[PDB]
Amino acid sequence: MHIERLAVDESVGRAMPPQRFIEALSDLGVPVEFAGEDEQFGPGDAVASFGHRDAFLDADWVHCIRAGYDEFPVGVYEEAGTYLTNSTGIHGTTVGETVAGYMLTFARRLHAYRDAQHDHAWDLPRYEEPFTLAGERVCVVGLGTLGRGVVDRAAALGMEVVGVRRSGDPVDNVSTVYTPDRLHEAIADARFVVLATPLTDETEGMVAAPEFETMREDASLVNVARGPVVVESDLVAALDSGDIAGAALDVFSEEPLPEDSPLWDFEDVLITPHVSAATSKYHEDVAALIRENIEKIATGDELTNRVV
Amino acid sequence: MHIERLAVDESVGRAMPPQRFIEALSDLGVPVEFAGEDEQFGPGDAVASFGHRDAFLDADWVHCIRAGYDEFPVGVYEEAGTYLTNSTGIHGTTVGETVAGYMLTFARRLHAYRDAQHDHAWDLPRYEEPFTLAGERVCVVGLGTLGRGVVDRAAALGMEVVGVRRSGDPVDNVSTVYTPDRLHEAIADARFVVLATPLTDETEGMVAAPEFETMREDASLVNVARGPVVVESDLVAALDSGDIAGAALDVFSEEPLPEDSPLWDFEDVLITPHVSAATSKYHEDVAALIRENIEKIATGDELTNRVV
Ligand SMILES: NC(=O)c1ccc[n+]([C@@H]2O[C@H](COP(=O)([O-])OP(=O)(O)OC[C@H]3O[C@@H](n4cnc5c(N)ncnc54)[C@H](O)[C@@H]3O)[C@@H](O)[C@H]2O)c1
Ligand SMILES: NC(=O)c1ccc[n+]([C@@H]2O[C@H](COP(=O)([O-])OP(=O)(O)OC[C@H]3O[C@@H](n4cnc5c(N)ncnc54)[C@H](O)[C@@H]3O)[C@@H](O)[C@H]2O)c1
Ligand SMILES: [Cl-]
Ligand SMILES: [Cl-]
Ligand SMILES: [Mg+2]
Ligand SMILES: [Mg+2]
Ligand SMILES: [Mg+2]
Ligand SMILES: [Mg+2]
Ligand SMILES: [Mg+2]
Ligand SMILES: [Mg+2]
Ligand SMILES: [Mg+2]
Ligand SMILES: [Mg+2]
Ligand SMILES: [Mg+2]
Ligand SMILES: [Mg+2]
Ligand code: NA
Ligand code: NA
Ligand code: NA
Ligand code: NA
Ligand code: NA
Ligand code: NA
């Protein structure tokens, strides 16, 4: 096909300033322009956006600036003949680092020390509290971009790494790969269980009371996927009961996390506001995907990360 | 003529429960006995201690359970004929992990999110705040056990690593090493400056107003060495002025850090209570060194980590 301009929907501001992205693409080979929420599109238009608007169905191509596309109506794009791509592939370093940071925070007790800092308290941990990630086990559920970003960093810190993916096939830096059939075996002996799957009707509610029972009482859950992969109320009950020790949570069933959620108040819960992938260079990272697909369009090659 | 007993001074409790350590020393071939602060010593005694007591100068050998021995009067041990060893070599994984945790905390803004957690605030970072360690520069000052623990993990996370040591000679995972006379060159372009030297006459007050001026305004100091390597009042002044952005501090010129230190109150300072090396297995890690040196002394070999 033939792209005549890239419209940058104002919604991209949920992850990056639109002007930074626009200017980053000054040499793309088609003009790039800010688009407000009430604009119309037509033949030749590509649109980069955070979320979906029905107006985009008059464009030739929509690039979702997120990895997760579970809030796009994929069926309506098919019918309109509008291509849809996502941003999978670009979040491995940011998420991987964040998750390494969560794990090190728990091992080295940094969050407890931060709490004490507010009170000007020189508070020493219990002797049994501080440990090293070296030699501890992590299970990574989902072994795509996010999961591999986590795996690589965990392995380099000397962790024992296992994980779960649909094929069960070997993955670089993972000692043992399990199919989803064997989730309970995969999580049972892990100090950390990390969720890195898309939200689909197959992964929704995957981690609930029975999984928390299976998990070690000294283990922590990490959710950087989507909130509804966990049954949130079961997680609260598990934390209350001591079925698991704690959790690092970047995503929730309702975001922003409501103020009356019990999750805020657990010492060994870390709440982060859907920012495990945040980066001051997100504009460059998304721009690279746009450049790639503009080359594919020019040459008549299949688009990267095409959803429909 | 042999070591006939190992006394465990009560001061070891500053780091680990004494009876955990005593029980870890059950293999040794000499009895292991708790010693209170009024114990007398004599020929054939070895003593494991946190700090110095003049009573130890009647013993044959003191093992300091810390890496840093700056609080010991090394001069008087020589005249008394008492050997003195330290615990250098066992803190690379713990401190390396803690420092990686500090740097990831700053990059990923985890400390800011923890502050917000207390307020149930879903506070989003400014676009420029979150970054990745990958591609950022760290300068590690001191390239022994602690500094190489730091370096190896920084390198594995994709950082650019430079550093300083007395000889200025190469070190694995350090792309450029500088002599101490080139400290300002080493630190000038670093996003993180990590201190990992002993406290000596040479290093006391190494990092002061001129060093904070040279450092990038966006840089963070990490001190896991000893407080007095920094001129603490100059660090406060630099943070007030914005000469640097912040700091992760495990050690202080007075410990416990007084409740009225200005350092508690900076958002981008992390205070930790001299616990970057804390570990639930410290008793095992130190016992290994004791076993090693009991065997060295028994056989007439040079002692490991002999100071005097
Ligand atoms: N928190 C954040 O800011 C953030 C950032 C990016 C992505 N995400 C979320 O993470 C998801 C994954 O992103 P990605 O870029 O790694 O995608 P990806 O397509 O590269 O990887 C997905 C992986 O999940 C696996 N998977 C699917 N169903 C599974 C199941 N039932 N059990 C186990 N594994 C299963 C796949 O087989 C693959 O290994 C996104 O869909 C999005 O929801 C969150
Ligand atoms: N925070 C903690 O809990 C904790 C734990 C262990 C050690 N420490 C401190 O860290 C210090 C270092 O321990 P280590 O085991 O790494 O010691 P080490 O002897 O293995 O290494 C010391 C390093 O510092 C370097 N150094 C000395 N003078 C220097 C100078 N003027 N400029 C630059 N580099 C210089 C040496 O060349 C060497 O590379 C200890 O003496 C102790 O004070 C703190
Ligand atoms: Cl797969
Ligand atoms: Cl040296
Ligand atoms: Mg508006
Ligand atoms: Mg506690
Ligand atoms: Mg189940
Ligand atoms: Mg608990
Ligand atoms: Mg609360
Ligand atoms: Mg702020
Ligand atoms: Mg100077
Ligand atoms: Mg500033
Ligand atoms: Mg205060
Ligand atoms: Mg020998
Ligand atoms: Na991917
Ligand atoms: Na460990
Ligand atoms: Na459990
Ligand atoms: Na050493
Ligand atoms: Na970076
Ligand atoms: Na400066």
Numbering used by the authors:
A (entry chain A), B (entry chain B): 1 to 308
Q: What is written in the article reporting this PDB entry?
A:
Here we describe the molecular basis of the reaction mechanism and dual NADH/NADPH-specificity of D2HDH, a 2-hydroxyacid dehydrogenase from the extreme halophile Haloferax mediterranei, an organism whose proteins have to remain active in high intracellular concentrations of KCl. Sequence analysis has identified D2HDH as a member of the DDH clade of the D-isomer specific 2-hydroxyacid dehydrogenase enzyme family (2HADH), which has potential applications in the synthesis of chiral fine chemicals including alcohols, and hydroxy or amino acids from ketones or ketoacids. Structural studies have shown that all members of this family share a common fold based on two domains, which cycle between open and closed conformational states that serve to close the inter-domain cleft, bringing the substrates together during catalysis. The D2HDH dimer has an overall ellipsoidal appearance in which each monomer is folded into two domains (d1; residues 1–92 and 283–308 and d2; residues 93–282).
Given the presence of a chloride ion in the structure of the D2HDH/NAD+/-2-ketohexanoic acid complex at the 2’ phosphate binding site of NADP+, the decrease in the NADPH-dependent activity of the enzyme at high concentrations of KCl was consistent with the Cl- ion competing with the 2’ phosphate for the same binding site on the protein. Comparing the two structures movements of up to 1.5 Å in the residues of the Arg 165-Val 171 loop, that lies adjacent to the 2’ hydroxyl or 2’ phosphate groups of the two nucleotides, occur. Compared to the loss in activity seen with NADPH at high KCl concentrations, the absence of any similar reduction with NADH is consistent with the independent binding sites for the chloride ion and the 2’ ribose hydroxyl of NADH. At low KCl concentrations the predominant species would be a NADH/enzyme complex, but as the KCl concentration rises, the binding of Cl- at the 2’ phosphate site would increase, to give a NADH/Cl- D2HDH complex which would mimic that of the NADPH enzyme. Three well defined Na+ binding sites per subunit could be confidently assigned, two of which were in common with sites 1 and 3 in the K+ structure. This is possible because the protein ligands in these two sites are clustered together in such a way as to permit the Na+ ion to move closer to them to accommodate its smaller ionic radius, whilst allowing associated differences in the water structure.
